[PDB]
Amino acid sequence: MVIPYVIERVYDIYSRLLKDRIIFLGTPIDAQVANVVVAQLLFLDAQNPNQEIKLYINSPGGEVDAGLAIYDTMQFVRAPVSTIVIGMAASMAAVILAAGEKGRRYALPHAKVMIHQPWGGVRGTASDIAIQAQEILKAKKLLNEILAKHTGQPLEKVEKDTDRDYYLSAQEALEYGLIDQVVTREEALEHHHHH
Amino acid sequence: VIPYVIYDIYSRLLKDRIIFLGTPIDAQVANVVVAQLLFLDAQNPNQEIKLYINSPGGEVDAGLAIYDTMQFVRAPVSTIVIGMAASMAAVILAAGEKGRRYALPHAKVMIHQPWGGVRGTASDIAIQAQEILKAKKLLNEILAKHTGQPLEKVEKDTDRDYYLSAQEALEYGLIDQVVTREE
Amino acid sequence: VIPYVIEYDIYSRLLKDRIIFLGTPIDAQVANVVVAQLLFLDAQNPNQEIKLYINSPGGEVDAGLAIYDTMQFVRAPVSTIVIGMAASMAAVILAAGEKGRRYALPHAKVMIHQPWGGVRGTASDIAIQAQEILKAKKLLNEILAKHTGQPLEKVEKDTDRDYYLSAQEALEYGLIDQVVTREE
Amino acid sequence: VIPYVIERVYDIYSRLLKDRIIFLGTPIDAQVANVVVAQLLFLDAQNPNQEIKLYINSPGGEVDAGLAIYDTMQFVRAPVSTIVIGMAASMAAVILAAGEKGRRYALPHAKVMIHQPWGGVRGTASDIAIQAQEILKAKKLLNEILAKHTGQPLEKVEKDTDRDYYLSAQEALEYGLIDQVVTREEALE
Amino acid sequence: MVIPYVIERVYDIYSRLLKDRIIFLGTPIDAQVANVVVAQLLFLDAQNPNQEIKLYINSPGGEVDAGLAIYDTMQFVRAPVSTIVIGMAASMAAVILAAGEKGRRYALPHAKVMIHQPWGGVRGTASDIAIQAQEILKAKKLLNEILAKHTGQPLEKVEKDTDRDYYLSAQEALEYGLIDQVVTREEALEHHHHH
Amino acid sequence: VIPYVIEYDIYSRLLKDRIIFLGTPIDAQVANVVVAQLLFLDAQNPNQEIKLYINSPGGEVDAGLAIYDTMQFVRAPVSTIVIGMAASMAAVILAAGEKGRRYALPHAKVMIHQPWGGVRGTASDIAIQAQEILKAKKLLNEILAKHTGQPLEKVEKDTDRDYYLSAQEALEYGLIDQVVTREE
Amino acid sequence: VIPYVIERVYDIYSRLLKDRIIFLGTPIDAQVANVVVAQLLFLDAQNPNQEIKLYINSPGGEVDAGLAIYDTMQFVRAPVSTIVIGMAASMAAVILAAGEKGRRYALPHAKVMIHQPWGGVRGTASDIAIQAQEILKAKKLLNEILAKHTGQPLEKVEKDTDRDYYLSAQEALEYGLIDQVVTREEALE
Amino acid sequence: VIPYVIYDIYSRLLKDRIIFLGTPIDAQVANVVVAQLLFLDAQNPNQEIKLYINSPGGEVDAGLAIYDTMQFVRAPVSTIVIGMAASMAAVILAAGEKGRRYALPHAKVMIHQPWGGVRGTASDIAIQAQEILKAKKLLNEILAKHTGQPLEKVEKDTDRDYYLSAQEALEYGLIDQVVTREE
Amino acid sequence: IPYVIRVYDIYSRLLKDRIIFLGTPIDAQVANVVVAQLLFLDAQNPNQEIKLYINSPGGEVDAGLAIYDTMQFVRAPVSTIVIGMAASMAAVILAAGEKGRRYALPHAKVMIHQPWGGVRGTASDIAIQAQEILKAKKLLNEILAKHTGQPLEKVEKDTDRDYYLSAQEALEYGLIDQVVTREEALEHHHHH
Ligand SMILES: *[B]([O])([O])[C]([C][C]([C])[C])[N]C(=O)[C]([C]C1=[C][C]=[C][C]=[C]1)[N]C(=O)C1=[C]N=[C][C]=N1
Ligand SMILES: *[B]([O])([O])[C]([C][C]([C])[C])[N]C(=O)[C]([C]C1=[C][C]=[C][C]=[C]1)[N]C(=O)C1=[C]N=[C][C]=N1
Ligand SMILES: *[B]([O])([O])[C]([C][C]([C])[C])[N]C(=O)[C]([C]C1=[C][C]=[C][C]=[C]1)[N]C(=O)C1=[C]N=[C][C]=N1
Ligand SMILES: *[B]([O])([O])[C]([C][C]([C])[C])[N]C(=O)[C]([C]C1=[C][C]=[C][C]=[C]1)[N]C(=O)C1=[C]N=[C][C]=N1
Ligand SMILES: *[B]([O])([O])[C]([C][C]([C])[C])[N]C(=O)[C]([C]C1=[C][C]=[C][C]=[C]1)[N]C(=O)C1=[C]N=[C][C]=N1
Ligand SMILES: *[B]([O])([O])[C]([C][C]([C])[C])[N]C(=O)[C]([C]C1=[C][C]=[C][C]=[C]1)[N]C(=O)C1=[C]N=[C][C]=N1
Ligand SMILES: *[B]([O])([O])[C]([C][C]([C])[C])[N]C(=O)[C]([C]C1=[C][C]=[C][C]=[C]1)[N]C(=O)C1=[C]N=[C][C]=N1
Ligand SMILES: *[B]([O])([O])[C]([C][C]([C])[C])[N]C(=O)[C]([C]C1=[C][C]=[C][C]=[C]1)[N]C(=O)C1=[C]N=[C][C]=N1
Ligand SMILES: *[B]([O])([O])[C]([C][C]([C])[C])[N]C(=O)[C]([C]C1=[C][C]=[C][C]=[C]1)[N]C(=O)C1=[C]N=[C][C]=N1
How many distinct structural domains can be found in chain G? Predict the structure, then answer.
């Protein structure tokens, strides 16, 4: 990772966009990356609980527990976080996208969203498998409910849709409720009348 | 490795209607045990077959194959545990012809619930979780039938590893005699 | 370690008795050797029955169909007996024994599901290999429907994920004809 | 890759340390216990009366290293509020439960899991006997620590921890592991 | 490979069916398996140049040079060789199937045939690559011609068809000319009138 | 070994001059860092041009589109310059610079072709992933047609296999606007 | 897995040896040279006047081992007919070309390929110089052996073998490597 | 590894308009050489850039990148081979500003045709075979332009490895002076 | 490596004092960084001496010659000092310091021998590289003869196998000029 630098002020490129209240979620999600995203949110909200945070998303997903950490921290924090999917937002990364501030969830034109039920693995004795099987079942229902809340769709629809991989174009993601605008071009700064 | 007689040593004891189950149990060894039974019963459906057991267990499906074939075959099979009979190998021991299930003095029996592993999606895990649950209850029931113990007891005993001396295996019902000399 | 008997190894001796074992996962090499035993046993006597004991988790559809097609083609009727496990293609081979001569032991299982596989290549190449897997899926659903008697719309929905059957459940599904406990 | 902030350039975790925030987000081994312990000691030396927030996302780890973190929280004057985000399991559950009473928090979809210790020993029979006894004490010791800090009868924690025992955040409230399920930032009541 | 045995006569199962003039081509084709197939043909033709040889085929293909060895030996040998594809006959194995004695090329119902152009690889200098590139080009045209001969199809059709993987059902293989009969059931021995 | 200059490393200093390098194969991590540099350079001045030097063999379509979509979205016009090699997604990024501001050096190349990939799973799962690759294929053919001016039926037949273009050939195909030899 | 035939059970290659057939179907290293040489010596001891058929499918190998096979064919009284099925390259081409004149045969789609030797040397400068000289002799030696047995001028084989030179069976006829392209079994003319 | 001055040693010689090409050439090193040229020419398009060469060669595409950038940039680049300049690195040497291409006495130049590798189907190999053929002719032409030799000669010389002493490189046209002391 | 504070690592600080270390085996990347330090030190001041401490087992001839050619080319005189070991190309670099300013410590060694290498390829390709190694052999024998004063057939017969020299033996052979044991005392001088 040969990330570039910018300028008595030396940042790397992601650290400089952090000073502009931009966070990148660009890797698969495991505990380590959840923690560092959570920590950036906590810091940006402490800096100013009223300004918006932009969270750019390019991720294939990851661990439900780490994803929920990011989710719960977005809801908890006072600052509203606008999610923007560039390229790919799948599995837990779709959920994080859908859970931005309503009205400020954006996709670029050729970005995608994909959703599906969780997957995992257990080894152990029958008693041990039974316990973990029950745990994965709760996560499944829990994540279906979180999706239904934030898209507006009836829950038996998300359950049916996520049974296998469900790929959405950005427009299809609009029509599904996962985002609010498909953004193509950056508009001009605008003037206003003071009557 | 194995010595010869004028057969190899296990093949010669097969002409004396002796079968060895001395390895861990996977499909390949189940098949070859099943096949020896089928052959020995075709040779003579009334004579006894001795099945010497030294095994730590194995796959439930392969073990049941051996079990189902012992019950199905007309010849009565006497099970003898020398050294170790654990997990599915305990079940096979317990399912010899009642009255001719034998242990040597320092042999052991160990029983416990099944273990396994599943990868896949939530739907896929749910299915295999269900399957392991049936095998658990099924094997507890098979044990209760052949020892005489109440089923609530085998379920609580097999929750973790349950080691039995040969005498303790007598009192539990897994065998019929602790054999020391050759009468 | 397979044992010997005075003339054979144990599987070769039960072959004299017209017994064939399908006890491994199915790949081309084991299909060929099963096919070859059938061809030989039918040449030796096209009217006597062949017993095919099944303990297998399945395998490649192409190799499995080889075994299937050879059972239908050969004049001798082949009784399938599942001991322990018959899954995926091995379930199909079980179901395709001579009607009335398909047997399970009490604690044996059957499992059925749709095929799985993998393709690496360009988009054109994947499209071709995707179409091929789709035909195999429909083809195997149809073969199952014919030999169990079930409506095809049912096998397709049942095989969407792993579908485990006890031997009794296999009897009511049509995959076998008798759950055999004793020697009768 | 951790980002930086600004005659002062910190990395993001080091900056939240100036705000008396510590992260326990990895599995617990001696190396991470030591660095958590050291941050506590420093934060208490800077001001023994202000609170320390300890964010927890960890699957657990070695009992000895975990106890190090535990013992240091009790010993230090400053009260440490534990907050589980995502996951707190095994020793990490214990550390969660041992925050200042009333200041132990979970986010809504976070989890707690508890169970007895696991380990391994090679050696001769004499050697195995010794470390078998050691694991037995740790089991009894950790059950007691849990009972103290949740309020549950000890016969209950021993039965509950016999296998993996997963708790939702609400279930963790009811069990006594935490004090509030916090959904929004206003914890200024 | 735990192949079984049969009976002062001890054979393994493939060696016994060889005494019945049956040869198996069941593995991918490399020089080693070409040689052993070639050798069985030479022996069976020396035993009796007029009786038929049955060649059962279940193979995904292999090296063109080794395949041609099998092909050239079938044509050269006086005995007619009936090819039977059970399961799969692809690439060079399709060619070997198609080159059985016309009228005695058989498929089982669910067997397949697949054909396509050759593939390979070369490392070396530009001069060296040019040489091997020319070699692969001849093999391509050569194998297209061999297919056209033995199916009856116009050559620009086989060239077009083999550009990518071309899968054929057994019926489709009949209609293409690669085989002569789709064989399902073994018929009874039959009686004949002596008028 | 990247060298430093008195305040930066060499790529970070040319970033001050609104130069971005896309010199590796394209995966999500390099897409993100290119996207981020664009966003920063456009925030610094939405009217000045950004030069994007390209030496890349291509990469993942999703990451490439990220770079593409960000170039179109950002107000500043981005001049693409291929030095050495621009293939697969890197060709697309080249072709999508500001019309009239797409340049090749004399011996640079462009190569285009359809996507490739791989899927492992059940038949249902493969069908889904096969449909996805098919959309990407058509989508990328359309993006190429828009930015070169060629009829779509032509890009589809040209990209069926590897299609190598010299810089001049790239000029007559529409992928670039000038073959630049000197400094002018 | 090679099959068997029958108070006599041979494997298939051993049975065709009783018919004075030898297979050279692998790459050539010392081990396979020795076993080919040994079969020749045995077949010539059984009957020095009958022909030996040597079927060739090989990509070549070590010059020293190949020459062993070559020298043994010339030395032995019995005439050895070489038949290339599939492939005969490098040393295997040389062995093909050195069958009894008039009894060197190719099947229609078989190939011949010829080229100069390749190898490798590590060591000091003195050591490299020595084995460089050795490879140079082998090059010149093998070019001469080819010229003898094809009839071509030596300046031509040297230029032709500078890189890989692939020949169809017909092209091999025209070049002198073989005597007949045999399509059908009747070679009884 | 590399020492520091109060910059690291290569970065300090960059402020003296010196660039090192000391590794084998792949896309990553082409890019960083190209970038240094672009920067040095932006600093001052009239001053010379010295490019010290010790490299065994590399990928043609990356090499051409370096070549095309030297021609394109206004500043004249003097190439100096110390030790070794082979394959693409020879081409880059030969393409310095005519008259300021230098070798040290015991440095070498080696030239030859490209090498590579292709996997794939026959159609795919045909395409990449064609590509390597163009690169071969293209690089022979670039050599002929910058040495002055007839093209038939570079094609026959580069058929295998062609090693040149620095003097032999002078007479061939690849350089302009064999430099021994620092005048 | 330790640090000293302007801040430097220990080798970078001794570079300030016009000291260069050649302490690893010689491959292209270490040749380049040695060459670059020379070029910089000579640009700093073409008249002051550069000390080059040598502890190396040798390396690639091409990279070594790079270091050699750069020492001759550069105006500043470079004193070579072998501490511990100077073998193969590293011996050559030692011998090619400014005559009279080539030094060994008492228990240091010099070893010389002919080049070694390896080639894989076709006969034509091997012939070409074989010729190349032969030139390097003679070229390096000549460079040694030039800088020691020995007759060339002597270096050729001596370098046929490994030829180890003590520092004294290296003096008598011509590879160095002084065996230095104690840093010469700092003294007070008469100014009449
Ligand atoms: B996803 O594909 O990103 C998905 C999220 C959910 C919204 C459908 N993730 C999972 O299902 C993960 C997969 C995984 C990734 C890496 C390591 C291990 C597992 N599964 C879990 O997080 C999980 C949950 N409960 C139990 C076990 N595993
Ligand atoms: B034992 O330990 O041998 C035991 C049998 C006992 C319950 C009567 N065996 C199992 O539990 C096996 C263990 C195993 C062996 C080899 C590979 C994998 C697992 N389990 C199963 O066979 C099984 C059954 N149903 C589902 C999954 N696994
Ligand atoms: B089963 O799991 O045994 C199943 C058969 C079922 C549908 C009747 N087999 C397959 O799905 C096999 C699995 C496999 C085995 C070995 C290598 C790869 C895959 N799949 C195929 O045979 C197959 C066929 N065509 C395309 C891809 N895969
Ligand atoms: B948990 O899974 O995080 C758990 C904590 C306890 C409260 C149940 N950890 C342990 O039990 C650890 C696991 C371990 C981690 C890494 C290496 C080895 C073991 N066990 C121990 O710390 C331990 C204690 N006594 C003896 C041996 N091991
Ligand atoms: B096939 O897929 O079986 C095919 C045969 C032809 C009828 C289309 N085989 C090949 O293309 C082989 C592939 C191969 C397999 C194993 C190792 C190496 C290559 N290619 C060749 O035989 C070949 C031909 N000429 C040059 C290089 N390789
Ligand atoms: B190219 O070769 O760079 C090409 C883009 C072209 C069509 C404009 N890229 C792909 O085809 C990539 C290659 C790849 C890179 C890394 C891992 C796997 C594959 N394919 C995909 O991005 C892709 C997308 N959807 C499904 C499968 N593969
Ligand atoms: B050919 O490629 O089969 C060829 C034969 C010759 C007529 C051109 N073989 C060789 O050149 C062999 C190749 C080799 C094979 C295995 C290990 C090492 C080399 N070379 C030699 O036999 C050889 C001869 N002299 C010196 C070194 N190597
Ligand atoms: B040389 O050896 O450095 C040489 C350049 C010379 C002809 C001016 N390089 C090549 O021939 C490279 C070799 C290579 C290096 C690294 C990986 C793979 C190959 N060849 C190519 O760059 C190339 C060009 N077109 C097609 C294939 N390969
Ligand atoms: B020595 O051991 O340092 C010696 C130098 C010379 C004074 C006798 N080195 C060599 O001979 C090197 C050895 C080597 C080192 C690292 C990789 C490969 C080889 N040989 C060459 O430099 C050489 C090899 N082939 C051709 C030209 N030069």
Answer: 1
